[PDB]
Design a protein around this nucleic acid. Sequence first.
DNA 1: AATTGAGCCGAGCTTAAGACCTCCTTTACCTTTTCA
DNA 2: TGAAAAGGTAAAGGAGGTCTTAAGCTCGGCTCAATT
Lengths: 77, 62, 232, 236
Amino acid sequence: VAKNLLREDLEGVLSTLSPRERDVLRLRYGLDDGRMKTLEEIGQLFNVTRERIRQIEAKALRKLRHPNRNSILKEYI
Amino acid sequence: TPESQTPIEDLQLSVRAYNCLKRAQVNSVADLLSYTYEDLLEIKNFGQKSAEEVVEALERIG
Amino acid sequence: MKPRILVIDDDSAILELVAVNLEMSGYDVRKAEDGIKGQALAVQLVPDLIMLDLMLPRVDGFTVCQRLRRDERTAEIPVLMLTALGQTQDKVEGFNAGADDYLTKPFEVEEMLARVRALLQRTDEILSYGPLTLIPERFEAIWFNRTVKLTHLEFELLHCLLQRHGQTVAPSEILKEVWGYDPDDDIETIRVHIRHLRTKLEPDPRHPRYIKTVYGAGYCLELPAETELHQH
Amino acid sequence: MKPRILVIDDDSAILELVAVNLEMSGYDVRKAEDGIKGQALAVQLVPDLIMLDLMLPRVDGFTVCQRLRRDERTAEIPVLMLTALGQTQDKVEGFNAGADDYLTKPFEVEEMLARVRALLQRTDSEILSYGPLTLIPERFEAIWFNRTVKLTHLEFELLHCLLQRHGQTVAPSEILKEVWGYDPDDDIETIRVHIRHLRTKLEPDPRHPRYIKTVYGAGYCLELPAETELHQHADQ
DNA sequence: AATTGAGCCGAGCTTAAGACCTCCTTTACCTTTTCA
DNA sequence: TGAAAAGGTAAAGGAGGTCTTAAGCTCGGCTCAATT
């Protein structure tokens, strides 16, 4: 019951992020398929190539790392 | 007190300040006392000078 | 999942070229060398797209397309017909086959992939404009003919404005996109960084020509069209 | 209903050929000679199909298509791009614009009609432009004939309120309610000030206003000439 | 080999005060209408 | 013809948003030991 609850909270904070950003994050952590994908698979599947997804990932995480829009998950640790 | 039941029309406020307060649905001195100076400054187009005018009017009625 | 594409073509060399190019683009490709096998595979697999040759033996491509449109399981599957375009009769018969698009042989691979992308976008960033080119990998801007180094936030702000070039972007939208903050957070920080952009980009930061302030609305990036670069 | 097709092309001859051929096929055709008017017409009408030229003045066809895709009301409208096809760079930039199809000029009419039919088979509220005015909400600007006029927020909203009721008299109380959300009984005199600013920006002679008329005892009316008469008014 | 974290720095970032330019409001006085 | 009665224009003043600096911080990069 602590599994279904978590995902919902995570999905909510992900919604705040830009569509491309959240898609990038979901693919870089395997949130859908359980399989973490590299840069290169998203480099081919997505529009731009490698070395671009890393920037999107960092620009998304920096948004999540802020005390706003993500503070519940701090207790999950 | 009898001064707190006074309608804001008797406050002799400026037509601008009066019309802004009346636009904010503030009809009694009690209603105005329910707002803080910050809440008065949040009133749309209510400025610091108009808040000072309201303070001076309240001091005029004690 | 990977989109499934069924390619039906009797030219093994064309079929192989197409299959290789689609696989390189990341699609799951299925191949059929004849219209009967192609139809059966379409029925069995329900692919996300059918690419169909015209000149199949025993059954013309039009009859195949019509049969796919007559089967409830395949009636909605998009059909891209490949045609040699040479007779008005094949045109008139394609006008009744129910094809979604046409691609003339020989075709460029990029055009084919564009059509595939549009069809898939139907079933379901500005990096250069005029005098501005963004270089994400280095956080740099080409501004006319000069390279300008940007900070991460200056770069992201300029990118956000470029994405909405010619439109006024509200401060709350800038906060949401660049900083991910609540709409109600202090917008004054934005006012600072816009100034840096002007300091880097305007000829006179006191009379900004391109990064305009729309009082009460926000900021707008107005760039000259490429046709006007010689005047600026 | 008859499917609505918006054709946007600066070539009057291509635009006319397309319009005639579509009308012969039974569609309701709307025409725009520039990307800004085309965008405004698309937003106002929500056509069932947009045919969009590439080389529109003041706004390139790619920017027009991207903006149509950016508006929730128009994001789903199919866009058939007309392109002169000659450089791989316009190809590379179109690969990001979100166009649904391309048609190379010169095109066969039968091919055009086939693409139109396929797009229509695939698919299955404010006046922002009238006569000499395009309204530009995103920039709070008005195109008035061929001149750009910068408006304030309240001046823009007032002009929009008048445009919604073009040829009709708008009461001061209605203006107060729609633009300011104020009580009908609030002082309307403030509006009277801002109206002259609009006239100052829009009339040839603010003392003898031709377009922003006063209906004595009733309010203000925006009367615009029909497009057929524009050639007689630009010189003023 | 590949990471990795640590010190030592100045580049990126935020805070607060003050000034300062558009936008708006309301007045004082008019001009300009429709009507007895 | 005289007279309401509405409708304009030019100010004065304020309100609000948008720019400028002195104070301070903290953040990433660069080197460089120190290692799994």
